[PDB]
């Protein structure tokens, strides 16, 4: 079984995700509306709002707050789009192969995202990733653990305290490995399947950067982004 310390990390992480993820999706009415690059303004608002949620989550991860501000920024800048890709599995639906955030105006099919500058060269692996992740049928405890392990990766450009960040990530992986073994029936090979999802996230990150770079370089398109997106997905060090 799990120790009280590991159980506490789980409670902190599950609560942190509950505070920063709103199943009502009611804040989406404040984004610039969707238009069927007509979807860029709405999706840039969607992502900008999600980056803020991911910063709130991170701050509540045990030990993240105690990193230097420099390391915190390097981890979030490198991992933001991956945490977002992960947390969106909660709205993704295997039925219609789309993200469904309450109503039909906030239902993003694959065609919607092409209207925001992304070719299917990127959207194909992204939806395959979401479908595989959905098929894993993760527990909430395992979903949040994965997001926290993704954020707390020391193999990111810019991090300085490798040793402290890797220790944090190891402790989280041990909680997860023990959670699966003790609490998840039939999860014999599930830990490995989630480590492989991390690697897929790195390949999706790189493809997103290529697509995003083309947006960021056309002022008529980059002007539609938000300042948070521009700063977080930008290359300043």
């Amino acid at each position: 079984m799990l120790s009280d310390e590991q159980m506490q990390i789980i409670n902190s992480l599950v609560e942190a995700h509950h505070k920063t993820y709103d199943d009502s999706y009611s804040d989406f009415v404040r984004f610039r509306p969707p238009v069927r690059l007509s979807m860029l303004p709405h999706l840039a608002d969607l992502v900008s709002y999600s980056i803020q949620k991911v910063i709130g989550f991170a701050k509540m991860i045990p030990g993240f707050r105690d990193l230097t501000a420099e390391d915190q920024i390097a981890l979030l800048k490198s991992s933001a789009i991956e945490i977002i890709m992960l947390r969106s599995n909660q709205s993704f639906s295997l039925e219609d192969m789309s993200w469904s955030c309450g109503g039909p105006d906030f239902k993003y099919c694959i065609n919607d995202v092409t209207k925001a500058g992304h070719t299917l060269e990127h959207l194909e692996p992204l939806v395959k990733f979401q479908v595989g992740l959905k098929k894993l049928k993760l527990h909430e405890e395992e979903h949040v653990l994965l997001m926290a392990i993704c954020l707390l990766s020391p193999d990111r450009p810019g991090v300085q305290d490798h040793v402290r960040i890797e220790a944090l990530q190891d402790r989280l992986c041990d909680v997860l490995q023990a959670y699966i073994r003790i609490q998840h029936p039939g999860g014999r090979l599930l830990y490995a399947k989630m480590i492989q999802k991390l690697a897929d996230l790195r390949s999706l990150n790189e493809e997103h950067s290529k697509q995003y770079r083309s947006l960021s370089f056309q002022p008529e398109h980059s002007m539609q982004l938000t300042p948070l997106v521009l700063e977080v997905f930008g290359s300043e060090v």
Binding site: I55, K59, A69, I73, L76, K77, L228, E231, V232
Partner: peptide, 9 residues
């Protein structure tokens, strides 16, 4: 990173 720093605290 003015915004990130502010949001972090």
């Amino acid at each position: 990173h003015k915004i990130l720093h502010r949001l972090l605290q």
